[PDB]
Amino acid sequence: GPERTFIMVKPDGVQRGLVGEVIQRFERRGYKLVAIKMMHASEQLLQTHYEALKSLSFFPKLVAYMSSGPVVPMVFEGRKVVENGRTMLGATKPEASCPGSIRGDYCQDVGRNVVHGSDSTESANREINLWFSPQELCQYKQAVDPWIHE
Amino acid sequence: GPERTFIMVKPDGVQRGLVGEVIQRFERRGYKLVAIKMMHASEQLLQTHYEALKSLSFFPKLVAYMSSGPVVPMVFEGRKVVENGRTMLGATKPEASCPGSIRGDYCQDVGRNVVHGSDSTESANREINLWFSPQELCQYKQAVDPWIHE
Amino acid sequence: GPERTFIMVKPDGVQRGLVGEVIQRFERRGYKLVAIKMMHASEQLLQTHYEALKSLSFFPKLVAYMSSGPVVPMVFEGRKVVENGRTMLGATKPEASCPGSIRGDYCQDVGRNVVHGSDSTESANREINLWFSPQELCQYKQAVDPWIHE
Amino acid sequence: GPERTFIMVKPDGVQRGLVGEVIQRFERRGYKLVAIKMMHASEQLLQTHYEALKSLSFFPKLVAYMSSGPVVPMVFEGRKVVENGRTMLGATKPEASCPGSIRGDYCQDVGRNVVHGSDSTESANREINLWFSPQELCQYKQAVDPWIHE
Amino acid sequence: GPERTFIMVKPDGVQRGLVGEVIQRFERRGYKLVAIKMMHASEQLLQTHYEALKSLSFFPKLVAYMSSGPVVPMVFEGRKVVENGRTMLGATKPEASCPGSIRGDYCQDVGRNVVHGSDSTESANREINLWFSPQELCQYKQAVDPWIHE
Amino acid sequence: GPERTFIMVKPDGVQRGLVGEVIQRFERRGYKLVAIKMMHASEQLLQTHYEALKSLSFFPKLVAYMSSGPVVPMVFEGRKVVENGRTMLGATKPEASCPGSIRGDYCQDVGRNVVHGSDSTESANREINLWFSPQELCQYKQAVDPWIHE
């Protein structure tokens, strides 16, 4: 690609002091952080982020909650990072999440499940460009590259 | 409920220095500790605790083992805490337990599997009241409550 | 002695989900847990606990704060456990605490410093007996004993 | 203030996958993240950041190194965060750093010491405003606030 | 048996500083380390180690990679250690590995999957004797033995 | 040098499952493992290892204890690794050790203090060559080298 995924710590993950933990789970798997910021996300941005859900009953409540406190959008790079990101986050519903996953370790409620992650490569490219301008995406050559992929 | 489950560190979990680890796995998922104590559990208490097993060949051996060293009964409170407790503990048999679970991380033998957890809400209410008097159950309002459930 | 010290997680340590962490720091140093409970501590108990401070301006405020939410008293056993307990907790003032200590890792304010620990063997014996009846103190022989002391 | 300090993961901390670890050390002490970003820092920015060092022999080499790969500037908020930040980072020279500090845990060379932190409140205010526009500084009320300071 | 399995940190696990982590995952499950060494493995040794794969297209490339940097062979002892070793390592393919497993936590590429583990008791006995002479296998009685198995 | 130090997990560190933990503390500081093995150390080897102590009353008891169960000698390489090794291990006496050090985190008795480390570069060269033949010392180029030292 290089393959990239969009990860976002939600307002409850910020409140509960889990930003570094989410980042560390990607770093220890050898994934490269290429962008990050903390922001108050606007209603208009969140409506576009969740546009696939705009027809559903819970969409207005989700958009208001996601603007009720700061969030931390970020972008990770590496092999199979989209599908591995989804596994590392765990099932949407925490009670279906296996331990070792972020939601299985930290969450008890689907509406407070700490972190968002792209569900497909097409979604990831859309979300990365929605939240970050190209100038915010940093590029570097990871020294351990020969030892993390063949 | 508020929903509550009964968790008990078994004599081997005490010996192996895993009491804090069991507690921390519930705390980091946002669950509230509401009771805890260390005790030598009597044969009569353990026979009542395991009354569903009283007809089985291994019951006398289980009751003697569970009174052979101190145990740490405790009670946790939060959404889906009974079913999530069972997932966090792992399969009864450690070799069937996924890593990330307590028994998958620490155990190799079903008869030394570190920790007990209620299997149903009806069992949890029975076990909580069997091991703790109402005066031992503490109540407080968790400050992070708005960020752990909706 | 066997030497024993009294450790108590304060209301802020309970709220912030640090009970298991405090316990684990003693367990991994080979210390034996011999008693623990969660309780709402009464004004009368806390006045006796802090009787050395009864003449000081901040005593009424300290006693009210220490009864404002549940606490977790506990007792640990092993060689040099009183003096090592004080080192493991860190300076009273978090800003004077070295990292690696509980208060240096988790605290920013002397009035919210998570955990209490006996300052002398005479204080420890007094505090243990103040908070626990003899029947609550459990005794067992630690299997790793030959490898934790000579 | 509210008191704030500027923390920056240096290019070697990014390469070595330590961004989340630095963040987590501040979060677990109850400090609030209020800004963060990943960027390629320019020579002009770094010369201003290090203006106190502009007369010294190693300044050109330091500025070139600090622009040789991406960095992660960030801002933390809470009581005594400037002086506690310096303690948490450890001595400038890793060999003088106590274990438990970031540089004592991860570093072996003063020129690759992973992370920068403000040395005074006057430096912190200058550095925060140098690296972040006011619109990038987020504000929220931490739910655990009553339990982290008095 | 006593049952034993062969575990080997591959060249990428050495480079990425994961030797202690692999060892610790077995130790915390109560397994006994009975042999370990760091070596440059020769082509002839690796061809014998992987003799089941000698007919396959990727065998020469695998043998050259496995001799391209030092490896850490080791031997662990305890109940069900072969089958539990395979679960703890995770699926061969990291993207099929559950979090909590070594490859699910640290790996993104099947050709850089950090660690080898015996797939059967017959393979384990063969591999142990291939990499270690009998004099390198140490024997001791684990003090916690009564608390890790019945 | 390249500078190297000799580290040895003592019989109590093996029993207590701390081998991986000792290794991980050096790895996360960027130090290179260059040799390791598990062995039953003979009286003659240990008398030579501790020859500086041969005149002292406790020497025979120390030599018998150090041969009473397997040990794990090892060798680490990197900048200032001898002096940093001593800091990471902590004071000889655990009660004088700061938290964050190995002995401050895990030990309560000077005669069961888990791990040995060279006290000087002259001692390190002697001890490395006493415990390892030159063929056991592995050499490789660490990919992160440009980011761990200047």
Question: Is D146 close to B143, i.e. CB distance below 8 A?
Answer: yes
* Residues of B known to be catalytic: 116
Number of residues assigned to chain A: 150
Q: Do F107 and C30 touch (CB under 8 A)?
A: yes
Of C143, C145, C146, the CB nearest to E146: C143
Rounded CA-CA distance D148/D145 in Å is: 5
- Whether E57 has its CB under 8 Å from any CB of chain C: the answer is no
Q: What's the DSSP call for residue A98?
A: P
Residues in chain B within 8 Å Cβ distance of C105? none
Experimental method of this PDB entry: X-ray
F97 at interface of D, judged by CB pairs closer than 8 A: no
B140 touching chain D per CB within 8 A: no
Q: Catalytic pick from C40, C49, C116, C149?
A: C116
Give, in order, the Cα–Cα distances in Å from F120 to each of B3, F9, F83, F124, F126: 59, 18, 7, 6, 10
Q: Is E106 on the interface with B (CB under 8 A)?
A: no
Kindly state the tokens that stand for E44.
């002839």
Strand-pairing partners, residue E33, are E76
Tokens of B141: 């309002």
Measured between beta carbons, the chain C residues lying within 8 angstroms of F112 are 147-150
Residues of F in contact with D12 (CB under 8 A): 147-148
Of D94, D104, D112, the CB nearest to F147: D112
Of A73, A82, A100, the residue nearest A31 (C-alpha): A82
- Domains defined for chain C, CATH in brackets: 1-150 (3.30.70.141)
Q: Residue C77 in contact with residue C3, Cβ under 8 Å?
A: yes
CA closest to B111 among chain E residues: E150
CA distances from D4 to D13, D52, D72, D92 (A): 22, 20, 17, 20
- Is the CB of E94 inside 8 Å of chain A's CB atoms? yes
Packing angle of the helix pair C19-28, B19-28 (nearest 10 deg): 150
**What is chain F's length?**
150
- Select from F29, F99, F101 the Cβ nearest to the Cβ of D108: F29
| Given resolution (angstroms) | 1.9
Q: How far is CA B44 from CA A93, B13, B35, B40, B70, in A?
A: 40, 22, 21, 12, 15
- Annotated catalytic residues of A are 116
Residue F121 structure tokens: 């570069």
Contact E73, E28 (CB under 8 A): no
Contacts with B74 (C-beta within 8 Å, 6 or more apart), sequence order: B6, B7, B8, B9, B23, B33, B35, B36, B37
Neighbours of C, requiring at least 3 CB pairs below 8 Å, are: B, D, E, F
* Encoded tokens for B36: 């805890």
Residue with tokens 């296998």: E137
Report which of A63, A60, A148, A76 is spatially closest to residue A117, judged by C-alpha positions: A76
DSSP run (H or E) holding D8: strand D4-9
Q: What are the start-end ranges of the E strands in chain F?
A: 4-9, 32-36, 72-77, 115-117
Q: Which two tokens stand for residue D130?
A: 């140098």
Cα(C72)–Cα(F149) distance, rounded to whole angstroms? 46
- DSSP letters along B55-117, please? TSTTHHHHHHHHTSS-BEEEEEESTTHHHHHHHHH--SSGGGSPTTSHHHHH-S-GGG-SEEE
Task: Judge contact between E41 and E146, C-beta under 8 A.
Answer: no
- F128 near F6, Cβ under 8 Å? yes
CA B16 to chain centre: 16
For residue D46, give both structure tokens: 């770094």
Catalytic (active site) residue E116: yes
| Contact yes or no for F147 and A144 at CB 8 A | no
Contact D144 B147 (CB under 8 A): no
Q: Residue A122 half-sphere exposure, CB side, CA atoms within 13 Å?
A: 1
A57 Cβ contact partners less than 8 Å away, ≥ 6 residues apart: none
Instruction: Specify whether the CB–CB gap between A44 and A69 falls below 8 A.
Output: no
CB atoms within 10 A of CB E51: 12
Nearest CB among E16, E99, E109 relative to A149 is that of: E109
